[PDB]
DNA sequence: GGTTTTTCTCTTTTTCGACCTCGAATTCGATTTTAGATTTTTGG
DNA sequence: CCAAAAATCTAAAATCGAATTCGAGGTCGAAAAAGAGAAAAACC
């Protein structure tokens, strides 16, 4: 019933997700293959890709490049919060052909 | 701590016997009266010295310390004479005692101050016994060349338990107000709090540098009172040396005296004020060059604008902030834009958390100048300073010495911050300060050295599993 | 918990130096955590030292192994409490009386 | 929460506009004056009802509520008449208003109470505007059968942020004061704090049980004041219903009235007092049967001895403690010895941490009786109650109902506590309470089912290592 | 006079707050036996 | 009169506890700020 005013989106069951709050600003940022339809809070992000891909490759790509995509937008102030939206959003990764997925 | 730390503990013993602020007012008034009495006796009898004095009546001679120190104590109402007749009924003559130095109308009064020691108190004999016990306990403080007020610094630091400074950070920002400028004056302070950060330079430069006394402004009433007695304890000249009461956002004074030459401050954080704003304070002399005000949740940079208003043609400035005021929406962004409009903002230096009294956040200091080269230089600093147990650190005189060495001539030292460009900061959205720390300890390894080790792990592992299978005989 | 914090200068502080095979117990309000003194280590800030008077019977890594056998009370960290005398009483099984053969 | 929770939030809105205690005094005085005015008007005009009243002058008729409610409000100094002339200069007539019910010398005054609303305040117009704004904001509280004081319970719970009770625990210990005893009286309380725990029974038993009003004693002055107005709000008879001020360790009263029949309490913890002791308080009427005092760090059981002193021949008693008072050295051991000298200590029941306001420890309750069988029964209780987020739990009426079912007739229920013996407690060193929780979840397994599974792990593992060795082609 | 464009508010996102909140871990004062010595009393 | 034994008083190691504290790591509410739709003004 709470989706009347959850301010959330129900997402599909083959997704990835990533935190933007308070483990990074210090350390490694986690991520996980979420295998069920679900929702998350204010304090992290859900990502589905679009069809030109294989989704596990995106997961391993992000978990590989985590240690420098945290470096790209690390500080964002001395506040308790962490990485900006835009510089997180505006990173380029090498996306190959399907046989190299 | 040699012969000191025992007396620090004696002050801790004297800290009885109720909630701290109430008796603390009487404690500060007692030591204040004792110090004024001893300084006045030291002036009038440096050579025949008399414990008990006389009614010598010579007013013409009396008015000359009333021009010099501005206050006759009295003929016989000094402390050392009053210390003879202790426990004597009654005690309220001290009120009349505060009538004596408060005459002081000639010249430039600096009086109207000592209204702290009121009366509560429930009976007159309670008042007599309590105040006489306080005077007896403060008389036994064996202090007497005559360093006195550091125990006062302890007792004023013993509260909010406000937040003033861990005093080596004040010595640091004093060394930021350096260098080499025997140039009137020093030092103005908006929201001074105590006179602790308003002390270090001229106390170190008693006749090294010779400019003028100190000016400032502070919000609270009782903080204003303890600030005036704080600055009065440290044997500082009467000359113009004062702070006026008020708020810089509401009563900015003094404009006419003068464009200052050096300023330090500790502005409090998140200090939301009247919005946004109902008077014409956009169109004042200092916020109209910015372009927009400083609203409620972002009420910080009004202090730094008020700071940069009162500045000379050459003399530098140094203020403290916390790095959370980073971009803070477009209003603070355009405030930062007018700050980076020139080399107004010269350097910024971060300082590791906490190094304070349970705040627990990091801070940074902004050093400003109309003395340009010019490029921006974000020499921020992380670790190391110890922080929590005793003070801590506090703090590593060689470390601040070498950071002054870095501040001297613009080095580019990795594993530490370095210079940037104006092109870099317009490439930023005026950020404070992500650039330019580099080190991350991401250390390489070797494929083969790791994998043959893992093979050794397996050659241990499988035979130990075999021996467990041997041990499965039950 | 996790039995390791960082370095410190390891000599001339009156350090206990943690000789060949004592055992320790953690602690007041817990009395459950057990760690073999590995080689020669610190006296880190809460520890209580257990060894034995006898050598030719005890060999107290034997009783290190015997002490974690009994989580009977040691599944109860619940009340603010010291337990020193209480475990210090009894019991343990012993291959007596064919000692010291 | 149906039409309530909105008004709870309205009280939260009214919570402005300075530090809470200062304006909170005026808030409580305002709602107190409003409720007394409405109750007095409800008494005098239940049938011709008049918003505005007259100067009818008939003193002989006036003295009859001055015997009944003990206080005439006034002819025209009620709230509803004063609510017409709001914002009218001046405001200090309220002081003279407090002269009116404080006449009350006939009979059994219960006055001398309403000295809360003092004046600070810096100008008279500040006082007028502020107090008129407070009266206007408290007038708009749409409350009006007439449940009023639960918002008062909210506002008094909104501080120390003292610690009183999460009110279902008070309902629990009220149900411990049960059962079936229409027997004067209830209820004495040492260190009552609020009247919250002194409320539930007779408010539930308004004419179910009929014994007497309530007695008690409390330490602090302002806590005494808020306690008297707390117990006064809930429409309770004037009859003998009071608390006196003082400390039970220093002024134990009332001995002569009477040996009580039921008591509850919340004694504060670690409450060190004068030692050990300088007067002859060993040789009083209540500590001489013990054998030794309760010293400073172990200052708890003086309250429970003072509790068991004031008890009937049959009526039970219930107090709260924390289980850290366990053996606490030989002094508290021999205190426990005199407690277990009979079946004085009947039952003990533990309660899981926290179930309080950030304490964060567990507690336990001791139920005592001179109503014996006799054997000791340590029916302690662990989980489950939720604790932290909103209140929490709060709390599981079937769970307390079934623990009353256990308390009824002495069951022996495993996965839960049970009875013990006197031989068991002398086999203990009078411990409180290790016995008798049993369950540990140490669950067995199977050798073969585990090892062939581990063999399946190996048959996966070695071929996957082989495939890694295939993947070592670089 | 009608249509189009711009702005303002209202609906919906979204990104911060000298924090804050749960698991893990715990240093000083308060308080007690034992080590021991010294003094007093009793017995030879 | 002297010697021995017992009791008391003091130091100090030895225990013991703390309506907790420490700190690693995550808030949730809310201010405040951008996107759509509606209204108003200007131009053709």
mmCIF file of N, CA and C in Angstrom, chain A:
data_model
loop_
_atom_site.group_PDB
_atom_site.id
_atom_site.type_symbol
_atom_site.label_atom_id
_atom_site.label_comp_id
_atom_site.label_asym_id
_atom_site.label_seq_id
_atom_site.Cartn_x
_atom_site.Cartn_y
_atom_site.Cartn_z
ATOM 1 N N UNK A 1 0.825 -1.203 0.000
ATOM 2 C CA UNK A 1 0.000 0.000 0.000
ATOM 3 C C UNK A 1 0.860 1.254 0.000
ATOM 4 N N UNK A 2 2.036 1.182 0.632
ATOM 5 C CA UNK A 2 2.904 2.332 0.865
ATOM 6 C C UNK A 2 3.432 2.976 -0.407
ATOM 7 N N UNK A 3 3.258 2.351 -1.577
ATOM 8 C CA UNK A 3 3.634 2.975 -2.839
ATOM 9 C C UNK A 3 2.686 4.101 -3.229
ATOM 10 N N UNK A 4 1.618 4.323 -2.453
ATOM 11 C CA UNK A 4 0.811 5.526 -2.624
ATOM 12 C C UNK A 4 1.639 6.786 -2.389
ATOM 13 N N UNK A 5 2.506 6.778 -1.370
ATOM 14 C CA UNK A 5 3.382 7.919 -1.127
ATOM 15 C C UNK A 5 4.794 7.495 -0.732
ATOM 16 N N UNK A 6 5.312 6.412 -1.319
ATOM 17 C CA UNK A 6 6.688 6.017 -1.036
ATOM 18 C C UNK A 6 7.710 6.953 -1.657
ATOM 19 N N UNK A 7 7.324 7.674 -2.719
ATOM 20 C CA UNK A 7 8.237 8.405 -3.604
ATOM 21 C C UNK A 7 9.340 7.497 -4.147
ATOM 22 N N UNK A 8 8.995 6.233 -4.404
ATOM 23 C CA UNK A 8 9.942 5.259 -4.931
ATOM 24 C C UNK A 8 9.511 4.771 -6.303
ATOM 25 N N UNK A 9 10.317 3.895 -6.893
ATOM 26 C CA UNK A 9 9.941 3.206 -8.120
ATOM 27 C C UNK A 9 10.167 1.723 -7.905
ATOM 28 N N UNK A 10 9.170 0.911 -8.246
ATOM 29 C CA UNK A 10 9.385 -0.526 -8.264
ATOM 30 C C UNK A 10 10.205 -0.886 -9.494
ATOM 31 N N UNK A 11 11.307 -1.588 -9.265
ATOM 32 C CA UNK A 11 12.295 -1.830 -10.309
ATOM 33 C C UNK A 11 12.235 -3.309 -10.675
ATOM 34 N N UNK A 12 12.744 -3.734 -11.848
ATOM 35 C CA UNK A 12 12.743 -5.172 -12.156
ATOM 36 C C UNK A 12 13.743 -5.986 -11.346
ATOM 37 N N UNK A 13 13.824 -7.280 -11.653
ATOM 38 C CA UNK A 13 14.495 -8.256 -10.806
ATOM 39 C C UNK A 13 15.876 -8.647 -11.317
ATOM 40 N N UNK A 14 16.512 -7.805 -12.121
ATOM 41 C CA UNK A 14 17.844 -8.102 -12.639
ATOM 42 C C UNK A 14 18.714 -6.857 -12.565
ATOM 43 N N UNK A 15 18.728 -6.209 -11.410
ATOM 44 C CA UNK A 15 19.224 -4.844 -11.342
ATOM 45 C C UNK A 15 20.541 -4.797 -10.574
ATOM 46 N N UNK A 16 21.180 -3.625 -10.588
ATOM 47 C CA UNK A 16 22.318 -3.366 -9.720
ATOM 48 C C UNK A 16 22.004 -2.120 -8.907
ATOM 49 N N UNK A 17 22.763 -1.925 -7.841
ATOM 50 C CA UNK A 17 22.533 -0.780 -6.973
ATOM 51 C C UNK A 17 23.869 -0.386 -6.372
ATOM 52 N N UNK A 18 23.934 0.841 -5.867
ATOM 53 C CA UNK A 18 25.211 1.405 -5.451
ATOM 54 C C UNK A 18 24.949 2.521 -4.446
ATOM 55 N N UNK A 19 25.788 2.582 -3.416
ATOM 56 C CA UNK A 19 25.578 3.549 -2.351
ATOM 57 C C UNK A 19 26.204 4.885 -2.730
ATOM 58 N N UNK A 20 25.698 5.947 -2.110
ATOM 59 C CA UNK A 20 26.251 7.282 -2.298
ATOM 60 C C UNK A 20 26.447 7.965 -0.954
ATOM 61 N N UNK A 21 26.390 7.206 0.145
ATOM 62 C CA UNK A 21 26.410 7.816 1.475
ATOM 63 C C UNK A 21 27.252 7.012 2.459
ATOM 64 N N UNK A 22 28.345 7.618 2.922
ATOM 65 C CA UNK A 22 28.991 7.470 4.224
ATOM 66 C C UNK A 22 29.832 6.203 4.437
ATOM 67 N N UNK A 23 29.876 5.251 3.508
ATOM 68 C CA UNK A 23 30.926 4.236 3.559
ATOM 69 C C UNK A 23 32.103 4.636 2.685
ATOM 70 N N UNK A 24 31.822 4.960 1.428
ATOM 71 C CA UNK A 24 32.585 5.959 0.693
ATOM 72 C C UNK A 24 32.439 7.313 1.363
ATOM 73 N N UNK A 25 33.336 8.233 0.988
ATOM 74 C CA UNK A 25 33.968 9.345 1.701
ATOM 75 C C UNK A 25 35.075 8.808 2.605
ATOM 76 N N UNK A 26 35.160 7.495 2.811
ATOM 77 C CA UNK A 26 36.267 6.877 3.528
ATOM 78 C C UNK A 26 36.899 5.691 2.812
ATOM 79 N N UNK A 27 36.124 4.826 2.163
ATOM 80 C CA UNK A 27 36.516 3.438 1.924
ATOM 81 C C UNK A 27 35.921 2.979 0.595
ATOM 82 N N UNK A 28 35.789 1.661 0.433
ATOM 83 C CA UNK A 28 35.237 1.098 -0.791
ATOM 84 C C UNK A 28 33.708 1.180 -0.776
ATOM 85 N N UNK A 29 33.136 1.503 -1.935
ATOM 86 C CA UNK A 29 31.687 1.562 -2.103
ATOM 87 C C UNK A 29 31.137 0.208 -2.528
ATOM 88 N N UNK A 30 30.173 -0.348 -1.805
ATOM 89 C CA UNK A 30 29.614 -1.646 -2.190
ATOM 90 C C UNK A 30 28.646 -1.520 -3.354
ATOM 91 N N UNK A 31 28.285 -2.682 -3.891
ATOM 92 C CA UNK A 31 27.320 -2.860 -4.968
ATOM 93 C C UNK A 31 26.928 -4.329 -4.995
ATOM 94 N N UNK A 32 25.743 -4.609 -5.536
ATOM 95 C CA UNK A 32 25.231 -5.969 -5.486
ATOM 96 C C UNK A 32 24.290 -6.234 -6.650
ATOM 97 N N UNK A 33 24.248 -7.501 -7.058
ATOM 98 C CA UNK A 33 23.253 -7.995 -8.006
ATOM 99 C C UNK A 33 21.957 -8.158 -7.236
ATOM 100 N N UNK A 34 21.027 -7.226 -7.405
ATOM 101 C CA UNK A 34 19.734 -7.450 -6.770
ATOM 102 C C UNK A 34 18.852 -8.226 -7.742
ATOM 103 N N UNK A 35 18.358 -9.368 -7.265
ATOM 104 C CA UNK A 35 17.750 -10.405 -8.081
ATOM 105 C C UNK A 35 16.232 -10.422 -7.918
ATOM 106 N N UNK A 36 15.698 -9.563 -7.059
ATOM 107 C CA UNK A 36 14.260 -9.509 -6.819
ATOM 108 C C UNK A 36 13.773 -8.099 -7.141
ATOM 109 N N UNK A 37 12.490 -7.889 -7.446
ATOM 110 C CA UNK A 37 11.988 -6.512 -7.540
ATOM 111 C C UNK A 37 11.923 -5.895 -6.153
ATOM 112 N N UNK A 38 12.404 -4.668 -6.034
ATOM 113 C CA UNK A 38 12.657 -4.094 -4.717
ATOM 114 C C UNK A 38 12.654 -2.573 -4.839
ATOM 115 N N UNK A 39 12.838 -1.899 -3.705
ATOM 116 C CA UNK A 39 13.071 -0.462 -3.661
ATOM 117 C C UNK A 39 14.193 -0.190 -2.671
ATOM 118 N N UNK A 40 14.793 0.990 -2.797
ATOM 119 C CA UNK A 40 15.837 1.444 -1.892
ATOM 120 C C UNK A 40 15.524 2.848 -1.398
ATOM 121 N N UNK A 41 16.304 3.292 -0.415
ATOM 122 C CA UNK A 41 15.995 4.514 0.311
ATOM 123 C C UNK A 41 16.402 5.786 -0.415
ATOM 124 N N UNK A 42 16.432 6.887 0.338
ATOM 125 C CA UNK A 42 17.019 8.143 -0.103
ATOM 126 C C UNK A 42 18.486 8.015 -0.477
ATOM 127 N N UNK A 43 19.226 7.123 0.181
ATOM 128 C CA UNK A 43 20.663 7.279 0.355
ATOM 129 C C UNK A 43 21.491 6.401 -0.575
ATOM 130 N N UNK A 44 20.907 5.908 -1.662
ATOM 131 C CA UNK A 44 21.642 5.109 -2.641
ATOM 132 C C UNK A 44 20.885 5.168 -3.963
ATOM 133 N N UNK A 45 21.396 4.451 -4.964
ATOM 134 C CA UNK A 45 20.892 4.528 -6.330
ATOM 135 C C UNK A 45 20.696 3.134 -6.905
ATOM 136 N N UNK A 46 19.625 2.966 -7.675
ATOM 137 C CA UNK A 46 19.355 1.742 -8.413
ATOM 138 C C UNK A 46 19.596 1.978 -9.896
ATOM 139 N N UNK A 47 20.234 1.014 -10.557
ATOM 140 C CA UNK A 47 20.569 1.120 -11.971
ATOM 141 C C UNK A 47 20.094 -0.125 -12.707
ATOM 142 N N UNK A 48 19.328 0.100 -13.773
ATOM 143 C CA UNK A 48 19.084 -0.908 -14.798
ATOM 144 C C UNK A 48 19.772 -0.445 -16.078
ATOM 145 N N UNK A 49 20.425 -1.332 -16.797
ATOM 146 C CA UNK A 49 20.962 -0.965 -18.114
ATOM 147 C C UNK A 49 19.942 -1.200 -19.217
ATOM 148 N N UNK A 50 20.305 -0.958 -20.486
ATOM 149 C CA UNK A 50 19.354 -1.081 -21.597
ATOM 150 C C UNK A 50 19.942 -1.898 -22.754
ATOM 151 N N UNK A 51 19.836 -3.225 -22.647
ATOM 152 C CA UNK A 51 19.633 -4.153 -23.763
ATOM 153 C C UNK A 51 20.801 -4.299 -24.750
ATOM 154 N N UNK A 52 21.812 -3.439 -24.675
ATOM 155 C CA UNK A 52 22.937 -3.512 -25.597
ATOM 156 C C UNK A 52 24.115 -4.240 -24.980
ATOM 157 N N UNK A 53 23.847 -5.047 -23.960
ATOM 158 C CA UNK A 53 24.805 -5.363 -22.913
ATOM 159 C C UNK A 53 24.618 -6.779 -22.392
ATOM 160 N N UNK A 54 25.384 -7.121 -21.363
ATOM 161 C CA UNK A 54 25.029 -8.178 -20.423
ATOM 162 C C UNK A 54 25.271 -7.595 -19.035
ATOM 163 N N UNK A 55 24.268 -7.694 -18.154
ATOM 164 C CA UNK A 55 24.192 -6.852 -16.955
ATOM 165 C C UNK A 55 25.295 -7.177 -15.944
ATOM 166 N N UNK A 56 25.736 -8.436 -15.906
ATOM 167 C CA UNK A 56 26.793 -8.831 -14.986
ATOM 168 C C UNK A 56 28.112 -8.169 -15.364
ATOM 169 N N UNK A 57 28.310 -7.917 -16.662
ATOM 170 C CA UNK A 57 29.485 -7.188 -17.124
ATOM 171 C C UNK A 57 29.497 -5.762 -16.599
ATOM 172 N N UNK A 58 28.327 -5.117 -16.552
ATOM 173 C CA UNK A 58 28.232 -3.786 -15.960
ATOM 174 C C UNK A 58 28.563 -3.847 -14.481
ATOM 175 N N UNK A 59 28.082 -4.894 -13.798
ATOM 176 C CA UNK A 59 28.368 -5.047 -12.374
ATOM 177 C C UNK A 59 29.862 -5.179 -12.108
ATOM 178 N N UNK A 60 30.533 -6.048 -12.861
ATOM 179 C CA UNK A 60 31.956 -6.256 -12.626
ATOM 180 C C UNK A 60 32.767 -5.054 -13.080
ATOM 181 N N UNK A 61 32.278 -4.332 -14.091
ATOM 182 C CA UNK A 61 32.921 -3.098 -14.522
ATOM 183 C C UNK A 61 32.883 -2.045 -13.426
ATOM 184 N N UNK A 62 31.729 -1.888 -12.779
ATOM 185 C CA UNK A 62 31.596 -0.890 -11.725
ATOM 186 C C UNK A 62 32.381 -1.305 -10.489
ATOM 187 N N UNK A 63 32.303 -2.587 -10.119
ATOM 188 C CA UNK A 63 33.057 -3.063 -8.970
ATOM 189 C C UNK A 63 34.555 -3.053 -9.209
ATOM 190 N N UNK A 64 34.962 -3.090 -10.475
ATOM 191 C CA UNK A 64 36.363 -2.931 -10.817
ATOM 192 C C UNK A 64 36.787 -1.475 -10.701
ATOM 193 N N UNK A 65 36.029 -0.577 -11.326
ATOM 194 C CA UNK A 65 36.426 0.822 -11.392
ATOM 195 C C UNK A 65 35.984 1.631 -10.186
ATOM 196 N N UNK A 66 35.471 0.964 -9.144
ATOM 197 C CA UNK A 66 35.008 1.662 -7.954
ATOM 198 C C UNK A 66 36.061 2.527 -7.292
ATOM 199 N N UNK A 67 37.303 2.036 -7.236
ATOM 200 C CA UNK A 67 38.362 2.714 -6.493
ATOM 201 C C UNK A 67 38.801 4.023 -7.135
ATOM 202 N N UNK A 68 38.403 4.286 -8.371
ATOM 203 C CA UNK A 68 38.673 5.572 -8.987
ATOM 204 C C UNK A 68 37.424 6.364 -9.327
ATOM 205 N N UNK A 69 36.260 5.718 -9.451
ATOM 206 C CA UNK A 69 35.056 6.529 -9.587
ATOM 207 C C UNK A 69 34.655 7.096 -8.237
ATOM 208 N N UNK A 70 35.149 6.511 -7.141
ATOM 209 C CA UNK A 70 35.065 7.222 -5.873
ATOM 210 C C UNK A 70 36.032 8.393 -5.865
ATOM 211 N N UNK A 71 37.184 8.238 -6.521
ATOM 212 C CA UNK A 71 38.174 9.306 -6.567
ATOM 213 C C UNK A 71 37.690 10.481 -7.404
ATOM 214 N N UNK A 72 36.793 10.234 -8.360
ATOM 215 C CA UNK A 72 36.363 11.285 -9.278
ATOM 216 C C UNK A 72 35.527 12.351 -8.573
ATOM 217 N N UNK A 73 34.726 11.949 -7.589
ATOM 218 C CA UNK A 73 33.854 12.897 -6.904
ATOM 219 C C UNK A 73 33.876 12.699 -5.394
ATOM 220 N N UNK A 74 35.071 12.631 -4.804
ATOM 221 C CA UNK A 74 35.235 12.077 -3.460
ATOM 222 C C UNK A 74 34.681 12.997 -2.378
ATOM 223 N N UNK A 75 35.205 14.220 -2.294
ATOM 224 C CA UNK A 75 35.054 15.035 -1.090
ATOM 225 C C UNK A 75 33.628 15.546 -0.936
ATOM 226 N N UNK A 76 33.179 16.371 -1.893
ATOM 227 C CA UNK A 76 31.837 16.970 -1.953
ATOM 228 C C UNK A 76 31.471 17.722 -0.674
ATOM 229 N N UNK A 77 32.458 18.319 -0.017
ATOM 230 C CA UNK A 77 32.243 18.971 1.254
ATOM 231 C C UNK A 77 32.726 18.136 2.427
ATOM 232 N N UNK A 78 32.894 18.811 3.561
ATOM 233 C CA UNK A 78 33.197 18.159 4.815
ATOM 234 C C UNK A 78 31.996 17.593 5.528
ATOM 235 N N UNK A 79 30.863 17.501 4.841
ATOM 236 C CA UNK A 79 29.644 16.990 5.427
ATOM 237 C C UNK A 79 29.722 15.475 5.586
ATOM 238 N N UNK A 80 28.684 14.926 6.214
ATOM 239 C CA UNK A 80 28.619 13.495 6.447
ATOM 240 C C UNK A 80 28.321 12.751 5.154
ATOM 241 N N UNK A 81 27.698 13.430 4.192
ATOM 242 C CA UNK A 81 27.332 12.841 2.910
ATOM 243 C C UNK A 81 28.538 12.653 2.002
ATOM 244 N N UNK A 82 28.286 12.279 0.756
ATOM 245 C CA UNK A 82 29.354 11.765 -0.093
ATOM 246 C C UNK A 82 29.055 12.182 -1.536
ATOM 247 N N UNK A 83 29.605 11.407 -2.482
ATOM 248 C CA UNK A 83 29.773 11.636 -3.921
ATOM 249 C C UNK A 83 28.594 12.314 -4.605
ATOM 250 N N UNK A 84 28.902 13.346 -5.401
ATOM 251 C CA UNK A 84 27.946 14.111 -6.191
ATOM 252 C C UNK A 84 27.150 13.257 -7.164
ATOM 253 N N UNK A 85 26.026 13.788 -7.638
ATOM 254 C CA UNK A 85 25.235 13.051 -8.612
ATOM 255 C C UNK A 85 25.849 13.149 -9.996
ATOM 256 N N UNK A 86 26.298 14.347 -10.372
ATOM 257 C CA UNK A 86 26.661 14.610 -11.758
ATOM 258 C C UNK A 86 27.972 13.933 -12.126
ATOM 259 N N UNK A 87 28.996 14.091 -11.285
ATOM 260 C CA UNK A 87 30.298 13.508 -11.597
ATOM 261 C C UNK A 87 30.269 11.992 -11.459
ATOM 262 N N UNK A 88 29.353 11.473 -10.642
ATOM 263 C CA UNK A 88 29.038 10.051 -10.695
ATOM 264 C C UNK A 88 28.415 9.683 -12.029
ATOM 265 N N UNK A 89 27.479 10.495 -12.495
ATOM 266 C CA UNK A 89 26.753 10.234 -13.721
ATOM 267 C C UNK A 89 27.609 10.423 -14.961
ATOM 268 N N UNK A 90 28.650 11.247 -14.887
ATOM 269 C CA UNK A 90 29.341 11.687 -16.090
ATOM 270 C C UNK A 90 30.703 11.026 -16.225
ATOM 271 N N UNK A 91 30.781 9.741 -15.912
ATOM 272 C CA UNK A 91 32.008 8.980 -16.068
ATOM 273 C C UNK A 91 31.893 8.097 -17.303
ATOM 274 N N UNK A 92 32.998 7.947 -18.025
ATOM 275 C CA UNK A 92 33.041 7.137 -19.233
ATOM 276 C C UNK A 92 33.734 5.808 -18.967
ATOM 277 N N UNK A 93 33.102 4.732 -19.416
ATOM 278 C CA UNK A 93 33.689 3.401 -19.330
ATOM 279 C C UNK A 93 33.843 2.827 -20.734
ATOM 280 N N UNK A 94 34.835 1.980 -20.958
ATOM 281 C CA UNK A 94 34.912 1.250 -22.227
ATOM 282 C C UNK A 94 33.838 0.177 -22.330
ATOM 283 N N UNK A 95 32.906 0.340 -23.267
ATOM 284 C CA UNK A 95 31.812 -0.611 -23.477
ATOM 285 C C UNK A 95 32.046 -1.365 -24.783
ATOM 286 N N UNK A 96 32.418 -2.637 -24.719
ATOM 287 C CA UNK A 96 32.833 -3.373 -25.915
ATOM 288 C C UNK A 96 31.669 -4.029 -26.651
ATOM 289 N N UNK A 97 32.042 -4.813 -27.661
ATOM 290 C CA UNK A 97 31.132 -5.645 -28.423
ATOM 291 C C UNK A 97 30.680 -6.831 -27.574
ATOM 292 N N UNK A 98 29.647 -7.532 -28.059
ATOM 293 C CA UNK A 98 28.921 -8.497 -27.229
ATOM 294 C C UNK A 98 29.773 -9.720 -26.930
ATOM 295 N N UNK A 99 30.605 -10.136 -27.891
ATOM 296 C CA UNK A 99 31.532 -11.236 -27.643
ATOM 297 C C UNK A 99 32.570 -10.866 -26.598
ATOM 298 N N UNK A 100 32.903 -9.580 -26.504
ATOM 299 C CA UNK A 100 33.718 -9.118 -25.397
ATOM 300 C C UNK A 100 32.878 -8.714 -24.195
ATOM 301 N N UNK A 101 31.582 -9.036 -24.186
ATOM 302 C CA UNK A 101 30.842 -9.094 -22.932
ATOM 303 C C UNK A 101 30.776 -10.515 -22.385
#
